[PDB]
């Protein structure tokens, strides 16, 4: 989700790169909040004493109710390299990471920070009038390029090849359009904090050149998480990697500058949104006649409903659509599974649907208490129709590969079939018909097995 992805990226980082990361207080403070609460409690227990603590003491701290959670915390301790285990006098004692402990203590008590949290220049503008709608406009134009609607403005080529290298946004040049994948609709489905984290981690996996450094991008991302909106910050404490980072995050919408090559930058609400989270707009009404009555005024929700609903009208408050067959066919040719569509409908349903689902489930439990049913917030007829339209695309499935037959002896056929089954490339074998099929990726192995 959100913590699991950044944690996994942190274990993907090597140990020496982690030790180089842990120098500044900002990244240690940000990493400390990713830990489980018992892990955070143990970190704060061990930060203020300069002697190693045995593992038996930390085992004694945890009650018998959540022992496995303690192990999970220890697993996180064994994953981010926050502890050094030491075998001394037959005992397995735990020492805190010295760079991490020094950095976190400098973050808490104050002292040397080497300007890792920025400095205010006391020239600022109000966030709502400029920065809020700047970050909003950047996010809506990039996510409207995400949904594929026509636009009079397109972002820079850097976020374009960000999407080209990504698993989402498959590309064709002979046609002139950019295709959304299943991962694209998954990206639209989740909340904007997880959206920022997926985009930033993929931008992390892109970069390998000497133009910018991995410790610099990590420190700057966690520092942008650590800053506060509404107050500006100045530039020379950042590296050249971090000036071009200011350029790239201004292109993405994380940070505001009035003009290029300026020394004063304004963090946006997305930077504060990066660390943690904090009738609805986009709530829609769906009936048995496949009608869509959506309370949406922003172009984003209308455009993302246009992916799988044939929209018919638009008001300032209403958007009128219909769940037709061809719209769902377009969605499935866009790779969008029906489960994600059903998820998008149920998380954006009207509260009237939710309440009526509770009276319907109350009537069900007073009707048939012997079985329990899920809270069907949507009627099952439209869900069944959506799943049938899902099934009717993949009624017929073609596997590409090669078929081998024409064996005079059954022993050779059985040997070839079991050789294909051992390497996991066979899809069918039949001794009565004396034919077996193998996949495209396994054609060469069977070929040079038969040749040799």
């Amino acid at each position: 989700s959100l913590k699991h992805s950044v944690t996994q990226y942190l274990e993907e980082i090597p140990q020496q790169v982690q030790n180089r990361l842990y120098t500044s207080p900002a990244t240690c403070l940000a990493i400390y909040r990713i830990l489980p609460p018992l892990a955070k409690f143990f970190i704060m227990a061990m930060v203020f004493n300069e002697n190693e603590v045995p593992l038996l003491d930390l085992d004694k701290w945890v009650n018998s109710n959540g022992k496995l959670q303690f192990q999970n915390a220890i697993k996180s301790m064994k994953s981010l390299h926050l502890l050094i285990p030491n075998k001394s006098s037959g005992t397995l004692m735990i020492n805190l990471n010295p760079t991490f402990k020094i950095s976190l203590r400098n973050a808490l008590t104050g002292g040397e920070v080497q300007n890792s949290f920025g400095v205010v220049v006391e020239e600022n503008v109000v966030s709502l009038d400029l920065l809020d709608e700047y970050s909003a406009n950047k996010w809506e134009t990039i996510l409207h390029f995400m949904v594929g609607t026509p636009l009079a403005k397109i972002p820079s080529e850097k976020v374009l090849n960000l999407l080209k290298h990504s698993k989402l946004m498959e590309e064709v040049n002979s046609t002139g359009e950019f295709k959304i994948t299943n991962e694209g609709f998954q990206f639209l489905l989740q909340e904007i904090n997880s959206q920022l984290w997926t985009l930033l981690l993929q931008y992390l996996k892109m970069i390998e050149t000497s133009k910018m450094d991995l410790v610099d991008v990590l420190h700057f991302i966690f520092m942008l998480g650590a800053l506060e909106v509404g107050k500006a910050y100045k530039i020379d404490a950042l590296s050249e990697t971090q000036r071009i980072m200011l350029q790239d995050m201004r292109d993405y919408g994380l940070v505001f500058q009035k003009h290029s090559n300026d020394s004063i930058f304004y963090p946006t609400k997305l930077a504060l949104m990066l660390t943690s989270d904090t009738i609805p707009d986009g709530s829609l009404i769906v009936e048995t006649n496949f009608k869509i009555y959506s309370y949406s005024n922003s172009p984003l929700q209308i455009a993302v409903l246009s992916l799988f609903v044939h929209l018919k009208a638009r008001f300032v408050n209403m958007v009128l659509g219909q769940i037709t067959r061809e719209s769902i066919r377009r969605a499935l040719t866009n790779g969008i599974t029906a489960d994600q569509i059903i998820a998008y409908l149920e998380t954006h349903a009207h509260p009237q649907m939710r309440r009526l689902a509770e009276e319907k489930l109350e009537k069900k439990l007073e009707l048939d208490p012997n079985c329990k049913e899920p809270l069907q917030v949507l009627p099952p007829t439209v869900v069944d129709q959506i799943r049938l339209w899902q099934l009717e695309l993949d009624r017929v499935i073609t596997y590409e590969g090669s078929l081998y037959s024409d064996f005079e002896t059954s022993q050779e056929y059985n040997l070839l079939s079991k050789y294909a089954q051992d390497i996991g490339v066979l899809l069918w074998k039949d001794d009565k018909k004396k034919k077996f099929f193998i996949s495209k990726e396994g054609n060469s192995q069977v070929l040079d097995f038969a040749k040799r």
Binding site: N49, E50, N51, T109
Partner: protein, 66 residues
């Protein structure tokens, strides 16, 4: 059932607090000197060992008696 302090010592102590507060409130002095921290940790571990031995275990419970 099973110390008197005058106002002038009171006021001079408060003034000492004032001049110790105004000049430099250095937080890093809270860090112990690797010995009193060890003693405090030892006392806390002994107390929590006592409390965990008492609260390890608390329909009747099962017993080894037939």
């Amino acid at each position: 059932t099973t110390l008197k302090v005058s106002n002038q010592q009171m006021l001079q102590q408060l003034s000492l607090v004032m001049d110790n507060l105004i000049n430099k409130l250095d937080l890093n002095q809270v860090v112990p000197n690797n010995e009193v921290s060890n003693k405090i940790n030892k006392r806390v571990i002994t107390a929590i060992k006592i409390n965990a031995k008492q609260a390890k275990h608390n329909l009747e419970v099962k017993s080894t008696l037939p």
